[PDB]
């Protein structure tokens, strides 16, 4: 411990920067909520979505269903003579994704270029305070980080532990990343780093990019799935005991009628 | 076990993460108040996390099978991000008191 | 018991009980209006967002129970803030159906459909108007139409 | 006199306008309180309409 | 019960802050005196740990929800009578309406 600092630089740099980043994050979250706009949904697309949900629910929950009705559903969906998915065809948009290009694009897109706006804020903050020493980090650091860490102090003998305001605010950004969700909730959009990146639950889950292709894919998926009546096994309950109905029947006396 | 509700699971996970982040935040303040070296500080953070996990298991005790399907998230969960938010409050009060 | 009940409660518990009633969508219009108008005259201070749903619920119960005066009293309060709101239009149409002149309610539903194409509630209310007006066969056909 | 080896790295910079900093600090809170009610009324209007 | 936990957490936080202030005063005194590389008193350190352990006990009790995993248990009390009526279809044609009409 050395480099005795003033008590006026801690009350005019640390607290201001902390409040600045806190309120910047909160303002960003509130503005993100405000700017959110609804997307128009057409009735045909809605019906397509509901049919997709129906077929997916049939795929998921198909064990607890009569075999005759299950085959009737599957025929109605398939129906080689007419076919609902076969005849009903909407407009088709020419595509562009390709196998190798999209396989690579999965990584090329990513979220690589989402740090620059925070770098702009850090640059402005460092521009305001040219020669300053905010705090020291207990973690030992290597001298090859000193140019990025100090960036404005002409000292070669000094250690890299003493950080500037730029890295101070940079670490302040991710320090409250998990703290923002504490006051807001699980779905938090106050991340200062990802400013332009849209983070939301997502309006209109269903995205039928190619209605016909999705129709055919579900048509073959419903042909692949088998039928196994999970109701046919009723003998397990046959030889058992009934004591839970004695269970809250004891605790159903205690409540009277209002 | 045949049918599982996502709302209850989400609530359980949210509560778990909330306590994990709060305990980590206070662990950072304690270490910053005392002032130690990096190795000892990281060991102390790990010890605090282990104590929190043990208390979390003690909270459930019996009938825990209905509450949590497994125990891996209880032991290993939010160890890196929690450390990221703990390092901030460790050095926040460290240099505020000693350096200043 | 009325004074005894009104004594050993607080507004928080009463509001929570009304919320639980909404969750269980029970048919207790008498008690809903009994606890509805009581908290509108005792507290009437805060919880606007809750009290709008409470206004709608109380008027819905009053349409069932015996009282159109409170129904219109809540209708004016609902219309004061949101001038254009389709839910209030649906509610007014339901009350109009309850009173007389079903045709103007049908016309209001037609206009609502003209404005917003995707309005399930108005179609359901029309299906219910023809459930009780005509035979159940036509209502079945229209319910099948909307369901399809 | 006092000699400065390398400018200054221990004392607060002389040209540090507090009016701008205080104005920004108060404006952030003012804008947050302004946008809070806007978000609330937007949510209410979207829910009702 | 929750109010007691909240008060205990607040008291522990206040004690932790007081311990921080005491440590700050000790270091301010240390900077006055040359050399004397000694540590802070163990009593206030133990008070700090006591305040840290107490505040971590109520922080877990304040948010305890632990809902049941199985989806059948919440609908174990709900009756089909309430489910039979729906809020979409409500016909306003009943004998109670004409019975309550005069009054």
Swiss-Prot record, chain A:
UniProt keyword Transmembrane present: yes
Effect annotated for changing residue 28 to A/E: No effect on EMC assembly but decreased membrane insertion of hydrophobic transmembrane helices-containing proteins by the EMC
InterPro entries hit by this protein: EMC3 (IPR008568), EMC3/TMCO1 (IPR002809)
Disulfide feature: none
UniProt topology in membrane: Multi-pass membrane protein
GO term, biological process aspect, one: tail-anchored membrane protein insertion into ER membrane
Major location (coarse): endoplasmic reticulum
Residue numbers on the Lumenal membrane side: 1-11, 128-165
Gene Ontology CC: EMC complex; endoplasmic reticulum membrane; membrane
Residue numbers on the Cytoplasmic membrane side: 36-111, 185-258
Keyword Disulfide bond in record: no
TM region(s), chain numbering: 12-35, 112-127, 166-184
Phenotype upon changing residue 28 to K: No effect on EMC assembly and no effect on membrane insertion of hydrophobic transmembrane helices-containing proteins by the EMC
Role according to the record: Part of the endoplasmic reticulum membrane protein complex (EMC) that enables the energy-independent insertion into endoplasmic reticulum membranes of newly synthesized membrane proteins. Preferentially accommodates proteins with transmembrane domains that are weakly hydrophobic or contain destabilizing features such as charged and aromatic residues. Involved in the cotranslational insertion of multi-pass membrane proteins in which stop-transfer membrane-anchor sequences become ER membrane spanning helices.
Similarity-based family: Belongs to the EMC3 family.
PANTHER family: ER MEMBRANE PROTEIN COMPLEX SUBUNIT 3 (PTHR13116:SF10)
Subunit (UniProt): Component of the ER membrane protein complex (EMC).
UniProt protein name: ER membrane protein complex subunit 3
Organism: Homo sapiens (Human)
From Swiss-Prot, chain B:
Function (record text): Part of the endoplasmic reticulum membrane protein complex (EMC) that enables the energy-independent insertion into endoplasmic reticulum membranes of newly synthesized membrane proteins. Preferentially accommodates proteins with transmembrane domains that are weakly hydrophobic or contain destabilizing features such as charged and aromatic residues. Involved in the cotranslational insertion of multi-pass membrane proteins in which stop-transfer membrane-anchor sequences become ER membrane spanning helices.
Regions that span the bilayer: 19-34, 41-61, 80-96
Lumenal side of membrane: 35-40, 97-100
GO biological process terms held by the UniProt record: autophagosome assembly; protein insertion into ER membrane by stop-transfer membrane-anchor sequence; tail-anchored membrane protein insertion into ER membrane
Protein name: ER membrane protein complex subunit 6
InterPro entries from the UniProt entry: Emc6 (IPR008504), EMC6-like (IPR029008)
One of the record's GO cellular component terms: endoplasmic reticulum membrane
Organism expressing this protein natively: Homo sapiens
Curated annotation (Swiss-Prot), chain C:
Quaternary assembly: Component of the ER membrane protein complex (EMC). Interacts with WNK1 (via amphipathic alpha-helix region); promoting the ER membrane protein complex assembly by preventing EMC2 ubiquitination.
Chain positions of TPR repeats: 86-119
Lineage: Eukaryota, Metazoa, Chordata, Craniata, Vertebrata
Effect of residue 94 to K: No effect on transmembrane domain binding of tail-anchored proteins
Protein's cellular compartments: Endoplasmic reticulum membrane
Domain of life: Eukaryota
Residues annotated with N-acetylalanine modification: 1
Organism: Homo sapiens (Human)
Gene responsible for this protein: EMC2
Record PTM: Ubiquitinated when soluble in the cytoplasm, leading to its degradation by the proteasome. Interaction with EMC2 prevents its ubiquitination and degradation.
Similarity comment: Belongs to the EMC2 family.
Protein name (database record): ER membrane protein complex subunit 2
From Swiss-Prot, chain D:
Transmembrane segments: 19-39
Coiled coil regions in record: none
Side of membrane Cytoplasmic, spans: 40-49
Location of this chain's protein in the cell: Endoplasmic reticulum membrane
Domain of life the protein comes from: Eukaryota
Disease: Cerebellar atrophy, visual impairment, and psychomotor retardation: An autosomal recessive, neurodegenerative disorder characterized by developmental delay, intellectual disability, hypotonia, scoliosis, cerebellar atrophy, and variable dysmorphic features.
Similarity remark: Belongs to the EMC1 family.
Subunit structure comment from the entry: Component of the ER membrane protein complex (EMC).
Function: Part of the endoplasmic reticulum membrane protein complex (EMC) that enables the energy-independent insertion into endoplasmic reticulum membranes of newly synthesized membrane proteins. Preferentially accommodates proteins with transmembrane domains that are weakly hydrophobic or contain destabilizing features such as charged and aromatic residues. Involved in the cotranslational insertion of multi-pass membrane proteins in which stop-transfer membrane-anchor sequences become ER membrane spanning helices.
Protein name (record): ER membrane protein complex subunit 1
Organism (species): Homo sapiens (Human)
Underlying gene: EMC1
